[PDB]
């Protein structure tokens, strides 16, 4: 009864995103906080490690029933979905995250932008001396959309657990919507939305009609 179901969505930013990388592709005269970029196209990306880590940390506050000092100390419902290196049962998880790449660069160009990353100028103001220290932070453009792909596998170990894993995936995406993807999101960064969130059985035989109903209705 092996099957694979692909949750495909559009991560549309509601605010500039700063996931943050190194100076490997930074400009030669830029005192910036660079974002993680594609090596070839030099476009901003959303790495699957960021999505997986943020979603796992968010779902650890809702689906654990016990505070976990480590990802290995996570509950079974999350270990079987995200993986557990200290559990022979759950060493390989059922979720594959994928790097998300910019998918509406043409629309952004037609909207009249000159680059797909902007530089936001902030400062910290001393509260005793009124002395301002400025910073520059690179962000992806607000109306950017990224192709989001998440592959969920079904084997005989998913005999009576698929309807719960589907709910956990929906809850993780929703929690990501009521949170921020990695960055300085406490100052209003990294707000995202999942658009056209649908599930397609890309391998095997499986019925995703009900799941797609809660995807496109509850979201």
């Amino acid at each position: 009864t092996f099957a694979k179901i692909k949750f495909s969505a559009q991560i549309r930013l509601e605010t500039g995103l700063h996931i943050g990388g190194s100076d490997a592709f930074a400009a030669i005269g830029a005192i910036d906080s660079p974002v993680i970029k594609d090596p070839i196209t030099n476009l901003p990306i959303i790495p699957g490690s960021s999505l997986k880590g943020k979603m796992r940390t968010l779902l650890a506050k809702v689906y654990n029933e016990k505070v976990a000092e480590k990802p290995s100390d996570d509950s079974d419902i999350l270990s079987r979905l995200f993986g557990n290196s200290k559990d022979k049962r759950f060493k390989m998880g059922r979720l594959i995250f994928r790097d998300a790449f910019l998918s509406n660069a043409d629309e952004l160009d037609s909207l009249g932008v000159r680059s797909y990353t902007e530089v936001k100028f902030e400062n910290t103001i001393d509260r005793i001396t009124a002395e301002a220290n400025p910073r520059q932070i690179e962000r992806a453009i607000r109306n950017s959309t990224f192709d989001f792909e998440l592959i969920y596998e079904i084997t005989d170990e998913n005999e009576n657990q698929v309807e719960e894993d589907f709910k956990v995936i929906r809850d993780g995406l929703k929690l990501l919507e009521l949170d921020y993807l990695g960055g300085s999101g406490s100052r209003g960064y990294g707000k995202v939305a999942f658009e056209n969130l649908k599930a397609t059985t890309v391998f095997g035989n499986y019925d995703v009609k009900t799941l797609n109903e809660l995807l496109t209705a509850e979201v």
């Binding site: 500039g16 506050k61 936001k120 902030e122 509260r127 005793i128 001396t129 453009i141 406490s186 209003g188």
Partner: protein
Amino acid sequence: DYRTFKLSLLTLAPIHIGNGEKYTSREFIYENKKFYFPDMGKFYNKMVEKRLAEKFEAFLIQTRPNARNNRLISFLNDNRIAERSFGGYSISETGLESDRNPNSAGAINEVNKFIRDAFGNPYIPGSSLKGAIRTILMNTTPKWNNENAVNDFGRFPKENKNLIPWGPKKGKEYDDLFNAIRVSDSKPFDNKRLILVQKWDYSAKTNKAKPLPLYRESISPLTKIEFEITTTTDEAGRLIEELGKRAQAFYKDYKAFFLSEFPDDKIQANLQYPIYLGAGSGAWTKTLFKQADGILQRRYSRMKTKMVKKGVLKLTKAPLKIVKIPSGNHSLIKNHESFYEMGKANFMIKEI
């Protein structure tokens, strides 16, 4: 475990948040009772098709215009250009944008730009509102507004950034309070809400307002802007649910400290919970003024523009506006010289 609040901001006065950039007088045109800010690329593209690219380049290259070759309208008049479709945007002329004539003297040479996104639409960043909220909260919490907030172990005093714990600690539970308070930015508003106010300083010693060459792009009074504030802990939930009645306490202390030394007609009245946002509202709106008194003034004691006593009041000029409220007709300012307390705004916070 997350609480979501909606903060509605109603500007009672012009509000400027800058990006460090400034329009020069060779970049905007004052005509037809408006300031037109064209797109420089579109202007240059239309000027290469009229064989005036070299003339425009010589106009922009010239580092020392005498008195009139510094304005774009002089170039548009000398070279006989009638087209005005260069993209960009426009700001309606107020009249109280410069104390002199904008088309006669040097007048508005530079305009401080409002913060914009990649699409050119103005918006208020969440970091700015978060800084204002943090000033309100720090000034009204007695465990943060004390003498321990000053780091005296140095050449000159500074703020004790470690007074409110932040960041990870080795082997200790995460204790960042202001990571729990998450202020989002605004959906962008339109350029029809922007004006071209000027800086005026009111001195308690001179008893008059003096204009200064500092022109800013500001949001007009009575603009509605919505923010979403998210809270992830319990203490921060109490703090944000108490954002009003802490803003009122902060404003009461600020009025008893600074605003009581100035004429009552220069001080605005509050419709909702007060707040001070952006540039131009003064030093005491951005500091712990109980502890920064003395230190702040001595920081400027050896400058030509010396801070005397507690400083001067910042009063921009913007058109008078009446509002219709349940109490009747309310004037935003109590004076007839059209003086707004620059940077002032009001807010209401609900628990959506």
